[PDB]
Amino acid sequence: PQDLEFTRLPNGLVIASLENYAPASRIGLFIKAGSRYEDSNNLGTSHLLRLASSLTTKGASSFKITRGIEAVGGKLSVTSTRESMAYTVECLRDDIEILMEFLLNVTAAPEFRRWEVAALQSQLRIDKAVAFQNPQAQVLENLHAAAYRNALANSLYCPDYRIGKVTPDQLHYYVQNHFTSARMALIGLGVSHPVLKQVAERFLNMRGGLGLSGAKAKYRGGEIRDQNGDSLVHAALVAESAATGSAEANAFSVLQHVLGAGPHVKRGSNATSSLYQAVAKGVHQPFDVSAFNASYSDSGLFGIYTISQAASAGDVIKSAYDQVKAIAQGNLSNTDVQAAKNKLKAGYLMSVESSEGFLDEVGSQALVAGSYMQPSTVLQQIDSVADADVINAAKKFVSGRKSMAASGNLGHTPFVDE
Amino acid sequence: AALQSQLRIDKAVAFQNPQAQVLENLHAAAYRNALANSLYCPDYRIGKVTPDQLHYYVQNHFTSARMALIGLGVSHPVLKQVAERFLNMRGGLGLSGAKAKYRGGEIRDQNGDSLVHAALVAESAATGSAEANAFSVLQHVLGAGPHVKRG
Amino acid sequence: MLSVASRSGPFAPVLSATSRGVAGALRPLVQAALPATSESPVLDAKRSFLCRESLSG
Amino acid sequence: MLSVASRSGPFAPVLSATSRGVAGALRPLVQAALPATSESPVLDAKRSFLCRESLSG
Predict the structure, then answer these.
(1) CA–CA separation, B35 vs B31, rounded Å?
(2) Min Cα separation B139/chain D (Å)
(3) Peptidase M16 N-terminal domain spans which residues (chain A) (predicted)?
(4) DSSP strand pairing (A224-227 vs A403-408)
(5) A interface mutation test: which of C3, C20, C37, C42 has the most A CBs within 10 A?
(6) What Å distances lie between residue A184 and A50, A175, A365, A413, CA to CA?
């Protein structure tokens, strides 16, 4: 009922105002900052920005904020990827007028006092050592540096030679160049339209102009191997792939569901994947193989990912490469292609059935496209891929230049020449 | 079990000049197997050296037919006598593998020093051949090392 | 299908004022540990167990 | 002439039960300091100078 109501402003901004009838409401702000906009002199500035959402601001202190929200039952969270940042707040239906006079105050007009900012800098060590207890946040940071040269290669965590030295002067400048009113989108889920604009008149008057935006992300082939103490080997291989919103994109999304990329029935041997079946032939030991994908705005990556024992880590990678070769020079059906169309349609719809997976979908495609497409249009995109577009896409992976990145006990693992 | 806090002190002392570091990443970046190992101990490994591996190593490699005894201010029969008690241990040599094949490796390491160190190398001749002298004369033509103080 | 999270496998971390830190989306899933022997190390400046945040009331 | 020190280059650690330990060669020699600005970084639980190991009296 009245599904969405777009509106653009003269400066250029996006506000979306769906209206529903539940005693809850969520608000969001989307910005085009990230970890890809920092050069060689100020690495790690954007990891310390998302820890400092609670410090003292111009219009309110840090006592009135950490305690005027918590007397009502609300929350603040900040999430970030390699190119976007999001601020989100929630509470009950009658208490939302007061939480939008805290959120717009955190981002528009902050301060950075010397004594406070010098105290957060042990939080970098604590936060970074927690995330790195998963053996897979490590190996996916050695894989972006092994394939790119400038912009996309920076990580999401602060380098450790660099922890005591982030100043209040590097932060005032990063904000002032990348937080801008032609760069942002404002989304309101269970609220009305005449009131969302009422707030934006005090959000755009300052610092309107677009910022620097450089460093076109050129491609390099470097390989990194790290040997430590782990009892199981984690490895990868990628090659360049086509970027989001084109027509060759959907031939790589359909392709991966043919190979693998997830189980459905718990505690049960997969029967639906090309990759998994051709590996268990031969090898007799615990193992794990996937598929991998990413669709950034100017380029993409695509490949495989393994987990296995140390004494047999060459057989697993070699076997998983013979199967992907077979599809390249002609082997495919019209039933398995059809099934992969169903795993992609169903999975898309379920991820927009909650109420936090519905802001993100609306909020990310009002930045890089400027409009909203109802899921009834999107279901047409997937279905009308020619077959023999899946064959063509898998032909390009076999004929590229590859990045490796292995992290365990590397005594039987192969270098990338084989 | 008490000689394993020494390794940390030694490795922190040896690494205060920035060309022990850059010369360890250059052998790993250029080889695969034999000559890629360092001369120090990896950090993840400090507390785990165990007293069976030392016995194993010494037994395999400290073999009689791989050693030389040289004395500078003494006569011939004294040394011969004292080293004749030194052959009771192990007659012929332990293993000697790993032919050390070549690869191209790039390794960059970023930190807070104020000066950049760099190195470009390429594969060349083994000692004991007729081309190593040509490479040495080339090295001295090109300019390896100074002669006059502060010149 | 924008929103790179919809393409299954690059990470994103989260941090809040009331809930504990979060990290990423699927690189693995189940049936990696449903075959046996996943030891799952523990208590190294302990990260939480199951990250108790969601109650039913 | 068949060693690795007769051709100046890669290092060779030493270590003693009466004197300090030394880090191989230096360089063929010390040209790097004749132009100014080689501060010789410090403040790292530092190692002293002049190598007071062997005397005359």
Answers:
(1) 7
(2) 10
(3) 15-160
(4) parallel
(5) C3
(6) 17, 13, 12, 46
